[PDB]
Each structure stands twice: as structure tokens, then as C-alpha cells.
Amino acid sequence: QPVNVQWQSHQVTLEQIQHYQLTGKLGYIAPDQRQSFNFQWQKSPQKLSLRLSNFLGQTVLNLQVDEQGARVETYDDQIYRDQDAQSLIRNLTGLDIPVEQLEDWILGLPTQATHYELNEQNTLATLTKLASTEEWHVEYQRYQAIEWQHQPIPLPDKLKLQQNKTSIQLVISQWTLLP
């Protein structure tokens, strides 16, 4: 089996995309709760902001991740801090969102220690990741070509994540790639 040069080159380009915004819908289904959220995801080097709001626009949760750790402002404006964003969100809301892994998956990058399959366009089709006893199955349902430094690059615009009984369906509205 030869190295897939197109896939490896795509990875290097994705690794350049360090400052960006992303908006869309996040559909959450689990045995304990079902939710339909607007999401606003803002990424910069070593930093992440994620706002979830309800279908009427009111804030459900605001997450900030930086070098100090994770900070969540909850729906009722209580403030909580801890070291791991996924664990903190789960303890405060019951929602299981693999925030750390999504920093790679949302762009179409794999994490380390993962299995995956490519599509015929040499980008991710499906991926599996065993993380903290959760076996995540990720499906890249659709890509959209987005301009990056004057070149069209495929980025996910429909992505589904599932582990156990929990599924997260992301549907993208707008990628905004920043200098």
C-alpha cells in the first residue's frame, strides 16, 4: 500500500487553518435528552470558544478553553471551571460533546491513535476513536469547498458523531477562515 500523497498534503493544509469561525446547527440525541442547538465555534491558537443557543437564540452554554483550563457559563449564569471541557460540560448539563477531538475532526483531521477510511476524494469518510472508554464513530457525510489563501479546500459541512447511545449531528451554515 502506497502513501496517499493527496491525503497527506490535505492534512498539511488543514494544519494551517488555525484561526477561524464556524456556525451551524448541532442536533443531539441520547437516551437522557434530545436537543437542537445553534452553535458558534471560534478557534484561535491554543484557544476555543463554543456557544450553544436554543432555537430562539437564547444562550444555553458558553465554553471557553485556554491554557488555564475550561470555563463554562451555564444557562442560569453560574460559572464553573475545571481542567477538561468534555467532562465539565457533561457534569453540568448531561451532554457528552468530545470537544478536544472535534478541534481536529471539525476540519477533517484525524486525531492520533485512530482508525479511519478515506473517500474517493482523498479526504476522511469514516473514523473510529477509542477515547476514555467511549468508542466514537465519526461519519463525514458531505464536504463544501472553502477558499483558503486563494485555493478551494474541502471542509466538512455535514458531520455525524456517535458513541454508545449518543449521536451528534452537525450541519454547517458558514465557515469563516481568518488570517
Author numbering: 33 to 211
Give the article text:
The LolA-lipoprotein complex crosses the periplasm after which the lipoprotein is anchored to the OM. In γ-proteobacteria anchoring is assisted by the receptor LolB, while a corresponding protein has not been identified in other phyla.
The mature but non-acylated form of LolB from V. cholerae (LolB-VC), was overexpressed in E. coli, purified and crystallized. In contrast to LolA, LolB-VC does not have the long-extended segment running on the convex side of the sheet nor a 12th β-strand. Furthermore, the helical segment that fills the hydrophobic cavity of LolB-VC is slightly longer, approximatively 30 aa, leaving 11 Å3 of the cleft accessible in this crystal structure. We used isothermal titration calorimetry (ITC) to investigate if the recombinant proteins LolA-VC and LolB-VC can interact without the presence of lipoprotein as has been reported for E. coli.
